[PDB]
Structure formats: structure tokens, C-alpha cells
Design a protein around this nucleic acid. Sequence first.
RNA 1: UUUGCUCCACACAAUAUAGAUGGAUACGAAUAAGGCGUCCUUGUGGCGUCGCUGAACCAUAGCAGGCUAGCAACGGUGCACUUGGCGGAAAGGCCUUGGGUGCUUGCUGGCGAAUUGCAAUGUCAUUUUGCGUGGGGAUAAAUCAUUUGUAUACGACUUAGA
RNA 2: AACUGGCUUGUG
RNA 3: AGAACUGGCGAUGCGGGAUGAACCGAACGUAGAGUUAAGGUGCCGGAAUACACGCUCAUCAGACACCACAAAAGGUGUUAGUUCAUCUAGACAGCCGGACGGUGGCCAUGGAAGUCGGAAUCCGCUAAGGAGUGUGUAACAACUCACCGGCCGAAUGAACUA
RNA 4: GGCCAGCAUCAGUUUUGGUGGCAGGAUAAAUCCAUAGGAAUGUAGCUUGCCUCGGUAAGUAUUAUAGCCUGUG
Lengths: 36, 171, 197, 137, 191, 234
Amino acid sequence: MRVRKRQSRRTSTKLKEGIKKKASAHRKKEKKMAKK
Amino acid sequence: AHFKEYQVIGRRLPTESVPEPKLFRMRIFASNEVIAKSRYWYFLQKLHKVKKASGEIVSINQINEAHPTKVKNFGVWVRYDSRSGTHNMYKEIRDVSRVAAVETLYQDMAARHRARFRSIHILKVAEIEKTADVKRQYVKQFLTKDLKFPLPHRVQKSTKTFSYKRPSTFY
Amino acid sequence: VEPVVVIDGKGHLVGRLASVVAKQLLNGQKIVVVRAEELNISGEFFRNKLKYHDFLRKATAFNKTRGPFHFRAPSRIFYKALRGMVSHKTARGKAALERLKVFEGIPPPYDKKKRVVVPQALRVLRLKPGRKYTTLGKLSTSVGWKYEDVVAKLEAKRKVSSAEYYAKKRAFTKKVASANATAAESDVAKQLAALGY
Amino acid sequence: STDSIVKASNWRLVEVGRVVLIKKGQSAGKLAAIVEIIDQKKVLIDGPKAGVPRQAINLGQVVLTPLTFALPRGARTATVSKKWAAAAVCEKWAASSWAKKIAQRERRAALTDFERFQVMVLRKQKRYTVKKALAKA
Amino acid sequence: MKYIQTEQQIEVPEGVTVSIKSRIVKVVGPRGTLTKNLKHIDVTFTKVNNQLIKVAVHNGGRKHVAALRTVKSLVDNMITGVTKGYKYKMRYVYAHFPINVNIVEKDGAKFIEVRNFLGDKKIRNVPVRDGVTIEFSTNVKDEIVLSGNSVEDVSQNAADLQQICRVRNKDIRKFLDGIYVSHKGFITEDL
Amino acid sequence: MPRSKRSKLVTLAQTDKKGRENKERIFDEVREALDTYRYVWVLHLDDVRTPVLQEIRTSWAGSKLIMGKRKVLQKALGEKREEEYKENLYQLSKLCSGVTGLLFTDEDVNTVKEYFKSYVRSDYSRPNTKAPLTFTIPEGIVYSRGGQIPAEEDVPMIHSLEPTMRNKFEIPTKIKAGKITIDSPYLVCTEGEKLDVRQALILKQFGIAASEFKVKVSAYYDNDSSTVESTNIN
RNA sequence: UUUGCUCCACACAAUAUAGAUGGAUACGAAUAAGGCGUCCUUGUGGCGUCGCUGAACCAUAGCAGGCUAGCAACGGUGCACUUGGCGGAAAGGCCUUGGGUGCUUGCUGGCGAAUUGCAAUGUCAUUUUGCGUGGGGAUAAAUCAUUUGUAUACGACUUAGA
RNA sequence: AACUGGCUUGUG
RNA sequence: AGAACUGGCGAUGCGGGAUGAACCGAACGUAGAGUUAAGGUGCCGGAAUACACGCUCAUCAGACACCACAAAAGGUGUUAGUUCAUCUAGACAGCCGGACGGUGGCCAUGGAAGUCGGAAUCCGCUAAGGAGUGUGUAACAACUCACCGGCCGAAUGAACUA
RNA sequence: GGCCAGCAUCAGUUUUGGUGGCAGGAUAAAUCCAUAGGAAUGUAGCUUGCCUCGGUAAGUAUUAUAGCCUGUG
């Protein structure tokens, strides 16, 4: 047909280290909540 | 790795006015000794108030099987803590030995549940003598009279990169 | 082993064939490939066609001429994937690919010569049944290789020619087997069997 | 003539009775027989005569022979040996063309250069005879 | 659950004969013959004797075995289509404009020709497949009958034919006219 | 077959399922009936009407007519000689093959065997049967009776049912204005042929109980004699 | 052609080798199937047999391959001819006729080898070119200048010119 | 002078 | 966001991560040989198209580093489980019969009869049959379940997790 | 008496094969021998049906005209 645009599956490093820093924020928030 | 089954007892240490506590026993599956020991202490700290420092090991014994090459139907009650709360499960095997059955179990749990060795618990093995009280079907169909079946589409694993023959399977 | 190898490409898969080829080229066996209208690729027709239209829409937007050539034809497909498998920019690469010759159908002079296969690339071993495959002749004619009905005609010509040939070879083997088995039960034959021949 | 002429689709079949060759392992060119089936891909065998133990094995490590004899499941090794020698398979196998070929490759690998020159000359002699046998008739 | 062996039975009667090389079938009976390729389906056939044939699969996934039951019913449909033969009956109804319906042959083409549809001038031809015959209904008004051995050919032809008069942009509740199927029977009547 | 199954249709109806409680209940209740009553009759009734059964029950209240599922009736009767409430019951448990159905009386045998020969109703074909009449439907307006009564007083058939006539009943039925018409006459059946299910349905649709109804019996038992009796009367 | 071009012979030279150093040894279709042989009623036929690796089939001794003697056979193989076919997908080869010419390890004899000195790639194949040697063959076009103008930024393009 | 961290999208 | 501790980078190269300030490994003189770490072994690319259990077949899968953001769920794709229910004293599918009387229950209306619609929820025989799911005609009628029962004989089904 | 190499025997380092003798475990467990008991995906044998006249069906039958499981030694 017109075969349309894909998203990649490429790594795109800023999002990797953003994921890691976001992850640590999530786990920090979990520890702040987990006393309750 | 390739597995073994072990017999362990722990004899939690003599304290004064309670010497020789009650020799808590387990049958534990692993490839070697120290892995077996650590799992005994892990289950034991779960099950009652022990620590390794407050406990001590009596003996390790490899449990061989009595009549290995008897084909057996085994049925295993297990638990596992996957990502959710922990939960139970029963599974059924036609196999030769307890140890090989749990080998296949560990891999199948790994497939179907992404289940780790570390987070598996065995409760119990049992062997079923009489047929027709097995609950499952996929073993049950391997119990019928005059059984025959084929190996369709058999393929031969050559070392060479070329063949000059236009191969076939057979049938 | 053979200086010139001649693969038949029927029943085969692209990638697996391509890998074994490329390694055989980089180690030096001059290799030639035929019948590559009748190759196979895994997957269904439509997946493979979606793929290829994606490769087809890739083009250099500032001038469409000079960029990624959407070679339509089957042999050149196979060459494409292989060129991905090789370091085509350098001389080891180029003096590999000058040890490769791809054709469709079978021209001469290889029809009078021996053809082989690969085991470890074939569909019929490697794929589970109940699973689809894609004839590249169908695919490439769907995407603009306008020669498919020709090659089937020529291969049909070849096939009868080879048919008469095999009839001759068969009769010759018939006579020869009768002659040898009749010559057998001689003591020299007994001694050959004693030594394992 | 007015009957249905589908053909039997001859399989080699796994069952209690199938006699089996082994291509890789320790035995690795020896025979045995099934006693028991476990699943699609594992079977429990034993052959005492060639020497092989009883064991479970995976099927892809073995290939089947067309040969079969009757046998009961859950057998013990005395029982299968008795049935085996009653059924006379070793002669049958060794008479089969396959084992001739195995012996041929074995002997050729076991063969001396001196005997290689011998086979060369004897083959030439046979060739002389046969090529006279042809081109005349 | 990876059923190990699945299987079905098909029943050959006395009159009819069947020839099955690899996954090709021919089925021959008194009305005639048919053939069918089934190479895409990956099963096994076996005779036991001459009134019953067994289809089967080993190591079936759900898709594989559902295909097994299907292929049985396909072959049974062929068997019925020889011994009985199949017969599909339609009617061509109008409120204002009578259809002129006809059969023609263009170089041996067996086209089916409709005119005066909804007061049109348009000719519409529909091909006829091999192996199927037409008859306009004698002594029954506004009715046509098809008969054949290939059920698939018959149904495809008639389904095409009612797919031609898919009247468009117009309220179906009003334009009740069209050409449709009365019923799907066999040829025989008696049996 | 974990997914790609059929969805079975769920509703909010009032009636619920019986289960084994009613099964064992009726079992012990007939076993209560056994010693109480004296005369026992096995009743083959294939075509049955709810008002006919209620008519028979309100005819004979001193009798009790019981129907229920077959194999449990065989159970409560006892199928072996070895297991049975009383003796000489297994042999008559053998014969009771059809839709049965049973009676517990203390009255005479003669009155009932002449009763059920006297007792005759009008019912439908109930096919795998004969129907003692043929029906041609004329090539005119079609009516609820189908040519039975005069054409002035019969009412034409409703325009709802006609596609059912085209689909189920295999018949060409063409629709002029609001009544329903046909173009050729249609004979449905003949005498002396086993009626088909579509044939039975068309005479049902006309609403014709042209077939006789009379119950047959095969056998009789008495408790005090403790003996089995075999009687085929229809 | 101070004999220039070309077909073919042998002498030497260079000239290199994406890399010979016994053989690229021919059916097709299918693989939940087939092949080979045989028989018949010739077909989706029957009957037997086979695969389960080419780990094969062919070829294969002689000084890197000699000089010779025979025996058995009229078979095999090489060289150059020559008859007649076949093949167009890039055929550039495959058959086949005839004889001539050798060799024949099918088998038995006789002579020689040495000393390259305990091994040193121990050289033996093919691509390309030139000079020479001696038998043949055949005798051009293009361009620039000029001119045109359907074209023309100058080139180019298209026309004519003994 | 233009995605912190997949930003933004139709539903208080 | 703020503090406190600690470790890395800063002065510092190397292997891998396709490439790289923050990741993983790692004690730098020049050389040889050996063995390995982290990462990997179809080809690029040195290394098993290794062995083996399973699951997956995407009309742009995944090869992710992971809990993490769209996110709680939809889905008649698929495999394995849990808890419940049914049964040769006949499970489920189906085909066949019944599926009633008082009753057309009350207002309500032109018409409302189990189904335009408000509210009631009875007993009778009952194997079973509702003051009555759904098509329905202006009403009525007819048909269907939900419910039983006849033929068949075999295991099946609801919900939930993963 | 310089350059390149080769063979043998030796040493340090190290990789890869063959092969023998020992110890342990439940002094392996198993197989295998005997013995006792048990049961079936019920072997012989018995009963009924078909009959293609021997294969099913359902019963019988605990080794017999196959064998298996368990316990002990």
C-alpha cells in the first residue's frame, strides 16, 4: 500500500538513562510510602 | 545444574535446660551440598524462629532412588512467589525418578511462568501407584493399551555444509 | 573441495543460505547460485511484501536517483542481503563478491553440471509444518520484476531435456548393474568384499 | 478395480518392541530395544546383548530400525534378553543391508595402505572384465 | 494441550471409489468424478477396509486438529456431490420491472445474462464455472435451478449472482426486489 | 480449549435447575409408593399433552400416575433380581423401553384395560408415524385451516410466518397484498407413508390434529400376587 | 608500411595470477513422502528392494612416469583427422560415424634409476605481451580545418564536400 | 529560535 | 527541594557496551607463551547453525537495559494452574416432544390475552412448566429459552490468576 | 669461522589424549538369583456375541501358553 512510518526499536541513550533515573525516583517514592 | 536429592536434619543448638531440640528434617533438591544447606536454613528461618548461628547441621545424605527404572507417575505439590502474592500449584509427570521430574518441572515453570529456582518452593513429591486418579490428561493419554506412535519428519544433522542428494525425511 | 560450486536455490531460505555462502566466499570457494525465483522466505507473503515496500519507500529525498536502489529482482535480492552480510566497502569484500554469480532459472553452462543443496538452510528441514513460506517469484513479480513467465518456460524446456538425459543414464546404469552383479560371485569380488568393497 | 487404492503410509513406529540404533553417546553404534515410552521424545530402553545399559534417553539421539518383535511393557532385562534371543534379531540386523554398509565403512576406515593398493589392482581387473562385457552386447 | 493423536472416520459407500496418492484425491462415482489437491494441510490418510477410511494427525495443535475435522467434512461434501449431487434453487423477484434472464455462450463461456434490472439498460454477464449446469424453471414462475457436483462451484456461482444485484444507495426495506436463494437441496429426490 | 470458545447465552430467568435432589426424591417417593399401592401399570406414552395428563390425574385421584427420567425409574424399580424393592420386578424392568411413565392403582384391571381402549383423543402426526389424511393446498389464498372449511369464514394466514414457509417448509409462497397466495397447488403428503418432520410441521402450522391418539400398555404387575403380567393393548 | 595489420607453427623473453596442483561426478516433484528394478489390465497400479550421509561413484602403480620382451583379449583410453546430428538462457559445449595413430597395470619377464648426498615448492598449471624464426590472409575508416542549420552559451549535435 | 525523562491527544 | 555519610569522574589510558562524561570488568615499563574477567559465538566478527525442556507465529513481533511511562482494562489467540459445579442412578453439544389450568390476575385501553406499559410474585397438577426471557401481530395466535423428558454415550462447564 | 634451518636427548612454563591402581557413599543405589505378597493399561485358560471364523465387545481368570509391581534376603 503506502506502507507507513514505524517507530524504531533503537536505544536512543537519553531515554535509557532517563529510565534509570526515573526508576530510582520511583523506588525512592516507594520507600517513602512503604512505612505506611 | 544436573540435580541431586538430599536429606538434611538440623539439631538447633543445645541451650541449658533445653538440650537436644527436635531434629527438624527436610528433603531438599539441589546439585550439591552447600546449596542444599543454605536452602534448609532458608526454609527453616521461614518456618520457625531459627538462625544459622543458632542452629547446626546433623548430616547430609544423597537419597538415591530405590527402583529407578520403574516408570512412575509423580505428582508434585508446589508453591511459588512470583511477582504477586505467593500461590500453589499441582503438576503431574510420567518419568523415571523424582529428581528428573523436578528437573523438568523447574524448566517448565521457567517457560510458562518466568519462574526462578530461587523463588520456587517445593512442598512435596508424591508417587502414584494406581492409574486413573491422576487428574491431568497430558500424561493420561500416554497410558493406553497397545500404544504406538510415529516420529514424523525426522531430520538428520550433518556436519557438512553441502549435500549432493536432494534429501528427504522418512516418512 | 569443488573449485566451482553450483547451488540450487530451491527449497532454501535466504538468510541461512546467505550466511553459509558468505563464509564460503571469504574462505574462497567460488560459488554460483541458480533457481532463485524458487527460493523461499519465512513468514507470509504479506509480511514480506510490507517489508519490501518499506525498503521501497526509502529514497533520497533531495534527489531520488542516487540513493538506496530498490532492486526488484530475486537474484539481486539475494545479493542485497548478502551484501549486508559482507564488508562490501573493502577489498576482501569485493574480491569475495567477484567470487559470486547469481542467476535466475538456470542458464547454461551449469545445467549440464552438477547442482547441490545445503542442508542447514532448507525450508523443509528447518521450518515447522503449519507455517508459511513465500516464493520469491511470486513476490518479485508482485513488486515489479517483469520476467517471471519467461523463466518458467525456459525451465520447462530444460526439464524435458534433462528428462531424456536421465532416461539414458538410467538405462546405462541398469545394464551396468546387471553386468557387475553377473560378474560378481567371482573370487576377486569375494576378496573385494573381504576387504570391504 | 472399483476399490479404493490409498497406500499405507509406511512409518517406522515407536512402541514396545521397537529395536533401535544409537548414533551418539557412549554406545554410539550399538543396538537396543525399547521397553517403555515416557513422552513423545523420551523413551526407556535396554539392550543387554550388545552390552548397553538400561536407561532413559531422548529420541533425537537415536534412530529407529524397521525391525520389531513382540514384547511386554515394564520388562526386566532377563525377560528382554530371553525374548531377543528367541526372536533372533542380531542375525537379522547384521544381514540387513544397512549393517553391511556400516561394516563397509568400518573396514575401509580400518584398512591399510597396502590393502588399498590391492583393492586398486583388483578393481582394475574387474573393470577390464566388465568393460569387455559391455561394448559387445 | 498438544493432543497426541487425533483422528476421524469417513465412510465410503459401495458404489463410489477413491484414489489417494500423497495428499491428492480423486473421488469417482456414478454421477462422475472429482479431484482435489490438499497439499497445504499436513495430515495422514489410511484405509482400514473399503467402507471406512481414517484421517489422522499426530502431535496436534488446536489449529492442526480443527483443520482435520474440516478436511473430513470437505471430502464428505464431495462424496455427497457425486452420489446425490447438489442442487441450489433461486428466485428473481421484481415489483415493477421484470428481469429478462438468459443463458448465452461466448466462445464456450456459458455466461448468464440479466437485463431490465430496475429499469436499467445494463447487461450484466456472470460466468459459469466448469462442472455445473443451469436450468430455468419449467412450470414454475420466476425461478431458476442449478445443479452440479462441485458444491463450492455451485454456491460460489449463485452467491456471485445475488452479489450482482446488490442494489446500492437505496433503501433495502423498500426495494425488496432482487435475486435470492429459495433453498439448498440435493439433486435426488429420492436419495 | 481455554479461549476461542463459544459464549453460551446468559439470561436472568426465574426457573433454576433441579439436580440430584429431585432425582433421589422421586426415587424414594416411588419406593414409598410401592408397598402402599397394589396394582402397577407400565405406560408407554410417546406423544403426551400436559392437559391430557392432568385430565387423567383429575379423573383418577385414587390412582397415582407418575412420570420421570427413565434410568432412575429403572433404578427405583430395581434392574437386577439381586436388587429390587420387592420380587419379580427385574423382568418387567427389562421391557419398559419407551417413554415411561407408570401408574399405581388399587382398582380393577378390567376397568383400566377397557378405559384406555375407550380413551382416545386427537393429536398431531408426531413423525416417524402415519397421519390418516392427505392435504393439497390450493393455488389461491392460503388460510389457517388449509382448505378445510369454506373460503368465506376461514381467515387468511398472517404475513409474519411466510419467510418461515420459504425457509423451513421448502414451499414457494409469493406475497401479493396483505394475505398470502400461492401459484401452484401443493400436496404435502399421502396416506401410507411415514410422515416427515417438515410434513408434521406444516400440518401443525395448519393446526390439524388429524392423527388419532391412544395409549398402549405392555404389562401389569400386582403386589399381592407378586406376579408379572404382559399385555399389549393399544 | 622502409614491409605495417592479421590466422596458424616453435625459440626466447618478459608479464602477472584474491591463488589448479586426480575429477564443478548433471534429472524433476515431494518431504504427513519418494526413488530404483520387475510384473501387469499401464495406473495416483501391484510386487520386491533402498535411504538412516559423498565416511560415496569414477580415476588411480610405471623416471612427475623411461627402454624392452611376450601371454590373454579385440575391450578401454589419448592424439590429430573425418561423417552425421543436438543444443540460443550468457548456445562457445555435448553426442556420434569411420578408420589411422600410439599406450594399455587384464597377467608374467628383463634393463635403468644412485650422488639432490638424513628435508628444504624443489619448480611440470594458466593469463598477457614483444622480439625473432616460416606458411597463409588483405588492402581502411575517424578527426581537425571548410560548409550547413532541423540544433546552437563555447563543446556538443545534425548536413554537404574528390 | 523549538521532547528534561517517549513529551502531547476526548471527555471538569 | 534541603541536609549528612559514601563512592565514581576530576590529573586516567585499556577490553566490552554498535559509537559515548556517568554502565560493566580491569593494579599500565618493552616483548614472547599460557589462562581468564565483563561481553559474546548465524554472517559482518575471532568463537558451537552446540546439546536439551518449554512457550511464541505479531496486517511493520521481540532481541530492553525492567518493575516504568502511557496501564486499570479490553481481546471467541495460545499454554499451564487455582477454586467451584455436573454426571452411564446418563455430564456438554445437539435433533424430537411437552413447556399446562384458574389466567385474557389488578388497574390501566380504542386495542394490551406471559411480552405498549405501572405495580403485584399466587396456588393447582406437577418429571417439569414464570402473574410469565425474546421474536410477535392492531389485538389474539404461532415460534424460542429457563425447565423437564426421549435418541447418543463421555467427561464437561462457570469464575479467577499467571 | 657468519646467515637460515632441521633431528635427538634434557630443564622451566603449559595445552591436549590414552591408561592403571586406590578410598567414599545406604561399605553405592540399581541389574541379576531365590523367596513372600499384591494388582492390572489383565498373559494363558473359561463364558457369551459376531463372524472377516479370529479379531473385536464384556465378563471370568492373579502366571497359567506373557509378564509386571512391592517386601525381605
